Design a binder for this molecule. Structure first.
Ligand SMILES: *[C@@H]1O[C@H](CO)[C@@H](O)[C@H](O)[C@H]1NC(C)=O
Ligand SMILES: *[C@@H]1O[C@H](CO)[C@@H](O)[C@H](O)[C@H]1NC(C)=O
Lengths: 533, 536
């Protein structure tokens, strides 16, 4: 079992108090999204715009802003239902561009979810309100997912005021209004939706939920990745009518090997598809259970490894007192459940309504796969145990350093501790993943509660925006400033962003000179023939 | 899920180095036993006697000594046995008094375990040798158990030089030589025996072993409390010839509740029967798995609940790929398996051989109970999670304080640290457990002269207000209270909340064991009220 690595460098508040924050009267940060050279930040009643080329002086000021508050009658209705007015606000929870000019923005609107269209360049409300049912949650403490694929919006949230109908929904475009089965613990059980990606012929979802492979034990939570077809048209007139015909979910296996594997089963966040040395990869942050000893880790799963688990066996529970087992291959119907029509094995079907009742009623009671998704190298890329907090947010620089052939990973924490890790992704690389720097990003004087929410890499401007429930802080990716001319300090920090120069000092690799001009040893860090400055 | 408490006070080295250490080429400590005011320390080749009435001046000086080095041919045969010369020594692994005059002593003898009888008064070889097979281990690095109950000795160890046949065994009596079924993975699978206790009509064993219920999952480790009957003599000629007809084992449940129970199932050490709040309980140290996040806890189980667990239903695996579930109460054969003959539900059967064969062949294929022994007061009595090390040894003072109504637990560690914890036992007591002091015990100057500082065992010298922390090469006498650390500062006194210390009108607070009336010592062990007390 690994041990907590020692941070090669630390950055306390006093070393980070010299950094600008955003407040804008609570911010109530909900999400953020970067397009080209502009970062939108969605909180309570407002959506701010920040020019990433505008380098701040006193404080990052919003270039523009979007105002949309709940009409007073909405607030009075939210009060009549019996919820406190602090929740009776229009917390912007959905902000997804449909094309290169308009954006779909959904807010909770005092527990009456609504949706509108705005223009990106001018933040102009051009149009009117689409209802927000099954697209924006009623509560701001919930998570939610919203994605656009070929014109159709795939959402994931709750659809009722009582917060009981957790659902994956799809609408808009030129298809049909599909959804999961209401109150069907076999399909999804008290989940917390996190992320979603569009790959191949499918759209994958990433969430966590109460596990049914542990129903004889406790209410343990597993990490699931679900999958649906883009061209899903629905079930036949008697089976799966107005429901999904390819909803397949599998388990993600973030574990430490040995004689008794240790599993990080709770998922806190994940990235999009990142090209990590030739192959597409998704990198997730997994902590342990609630009532457990807080430990966290960072696993990475490939997209071929995730497509294979769905090409595998299904999982069933024959008797109520038997262990969940794999369904034999000669007992699964035809065509191959989960395959999309007009593709591969189901190419003899042009619509999902022509699907037989043999296959559609099978996937209705066997939606869980048998295999679990293994990570690469079969061991996490980083872990953190001996501390009192859990890691949350995540972002990755796939190309770091002068030759941009190194991967860096930035993770959040429940206590505003953003960790920067040089990660090992290939056999021929390091010996272990090196925690380069540990930063205290929370700004008690500037902010206000110190749980990192999300991280946004600004690679071109060499920055990382760290989110909290009341502030966003711009932290430089590097800190070669503090090592200065102490050539040791810089080489012994092993930072790929920092490079030493003949001019007698060590600075960022994004300065202007050739890659060969910078000198460093991020691999080993050979301190030979040097002095303690 | 709670969190680690903060030490009210910490005793560092440069304070603890003002304490005497015992040293007796190393020592290779193995065990220690307290008889009245005498302590027997058993290590390699030798057995030391120290008088708990002799206040040390510079070093713990042993009074009497017993020597027992191995045979000349047992050094060089053990040389032929591949074993290193350091391993080829007579490590005393068993030292148990049979009566109040002589003692059974078993040693490894360079992987040729043998037993003898000595006299406590003289430590003289006043007997003749006995073979230590199934009684004393071949290897010193392993654990073992030995106990005398009703004339006979009940051992539990390994029996072969290759360390494969683990066995619970009985001898030194009028019957034959009973033992567990060798290689029966459903009876015993790779265990580490830790303790045994005679209670009622049974001898209960306490150990840990690879779980049979995690056959599908990983090689987990479950903590087992087993039990055998004392009047057992074996089965009939047909089934279980020269074997136990009452071997019943249950699982120990050290659990933090909630929507996802957190379990400590690796047993490290345990105590004997201690009367807590009126009922006999047993207190034990559990830790998480090896390949897990290091955490540890202190749980307490009442004997009544253990018996209620053993009077319950058995556990079976109906299908290879199914969950272990209970056996119906109509399918349990008569007489009640596990019950001792001449008692309760076997009052008619006068001997375990009069038993049938369906009952035996049932108890032969169902040695594992279904229920798990619940811990007292749901959540564990103590927890330690954020540290890099695991707890080990355990000792308990059940009558701390000037009124002797407080339970103070001392727990070892893998890094020479000892934790003193006033435990919350009954509801109408504390709010939660209070770890008063954290004592660094390992003495780098004396305890070594290689750096391994694993606490092995502890012994409570309540009659002399001490605690002999044991290591692999030293024993450190450690008082139960440094009431001198506070003295003048009433704030520091009531702030440590130690029941061993109390405040006096003389302006200095002291050990409550000084000879004055109980109503004279002022303290507040229920809250820690530093109100209206100046910061001295
Ligand atoms: C998790 O992955 C490891 C290696 O990738 C594998 O050995 C282990 O069996 C997996 N566990 C499960 C439950 O699939
Ligand atoms: C441990 O004991 C608690 C009650 O103290 C009980 O709820 C739990 O189920 C027990 N654990 C097992 C594995 O039976």
């Amino acid at each position: 079992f690994p041990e907590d690595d020692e941070p090669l460098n630390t950055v306390d508040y006093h070393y980070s108090r010299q950094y600008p924050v955003f407040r804008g009267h609570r911010l109530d940060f909900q999400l953020m999204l970067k397009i080209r050279d502009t970062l939108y930040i969605a909180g309570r009643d407002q959506v701010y715009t920040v020019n990433l080329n505008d380098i701040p002086q006193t404080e990052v000021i919003p270039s523009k802003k979007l105002t949309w508050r709940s009409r007073q009658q909405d607030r009075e209705n939210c009060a009549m239902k019996g919820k406190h007015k602090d929740e009776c606000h229009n917390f912007i929870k959905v902000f997804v561009p449909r094309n290169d000019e308009m954006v779909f923005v959904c807010g909770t609107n005092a527990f009456n979810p609504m949706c509108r269209y705005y223009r990106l360049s001018t933040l102009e409300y051009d149009g009117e309100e689409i209802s927000g049912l099954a697209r924006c949650p009623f509560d701001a403490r919930q998570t939610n997912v919203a994605l656009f694929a070929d014109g159709k919006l795939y959402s994931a949230t709750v659809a009722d005021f009582l917060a009981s109908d957790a659902v994956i929904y799809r609408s808009m475009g030129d298809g049909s209004a599909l959804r999961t089965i209401k109150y069907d613990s076999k399909w999804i059980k008290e989940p917390h939706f996190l992320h979603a990606i569009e790959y191949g012929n499918y759209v994958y979802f990433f969430f966590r939920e109460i596990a049914v492979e542990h129903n004889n034990l406790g209410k343990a939570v597993y990490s699931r990745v679900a999958r649906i077809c883009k061209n899903d048209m629905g079930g036949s007139q008697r089976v799966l009518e107005k429901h999904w015909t390819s909803f397949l979910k599998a388990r993600l296996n973030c574990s430490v090997p040995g004689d008794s594997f240790f599993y990080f089963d709770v998922l806190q966040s994940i990235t999009d598809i990142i090209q990590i040395n030739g192959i597409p990869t998704v990198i997730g942050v997994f902590t342990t259970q609630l009532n457990s000893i807080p430990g966290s880790a960072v696993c990475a799963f490939g997209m071929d490894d995730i497509e294979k688990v769905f090409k595998g066996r299904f999982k069933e529970q024959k008797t109520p007192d038997s262990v969940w087992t794999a369904v034999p291959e000669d007992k699964v119907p035809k065509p191959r459940p989960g395959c999309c029509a007009k593709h591969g094995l189901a190419e003899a079907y042009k619509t999902s309504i022509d699907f037989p009742d043999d296959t559609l009623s099978f996937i209705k009671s066997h939606p869980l796969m048998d295999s679990a998704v293994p990570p690469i190298a079969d061991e996490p890329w980083f872990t953190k145990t001996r501390v009192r907090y859990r890691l949350t947010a995540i972002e990755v620089d796939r190309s770091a350093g002068p030759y941009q052939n190194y991967t860096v990973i930035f993770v959040g924490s429940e206590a505003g501790v953003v960790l920067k890790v040089l990660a090992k992704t290939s056999p021929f690389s390091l010996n272990d993943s090196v925690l380069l720097e540990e930063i205290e990003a929370y700004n008690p004087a500037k902010c206000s509660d110190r749980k990192v929410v999300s991280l946004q890499l600004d690679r071109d401007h060499h920055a990382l925006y760290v989110a909290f429930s009341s502030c966003v802080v711009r932290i430089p990716l590097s800190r070669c400033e503090r090592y200065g001319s102490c050539k040791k300090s810089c080489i012994a920090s092993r930072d790929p962003y920092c490079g030493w120069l003949s001019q007698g000092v060590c600075e960022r690799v994004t300065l202007g000179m050739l890659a060969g001009g910078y000198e460093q040893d991020t691999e080993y860090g050979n301190t030979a023939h040097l002095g303690d400055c």
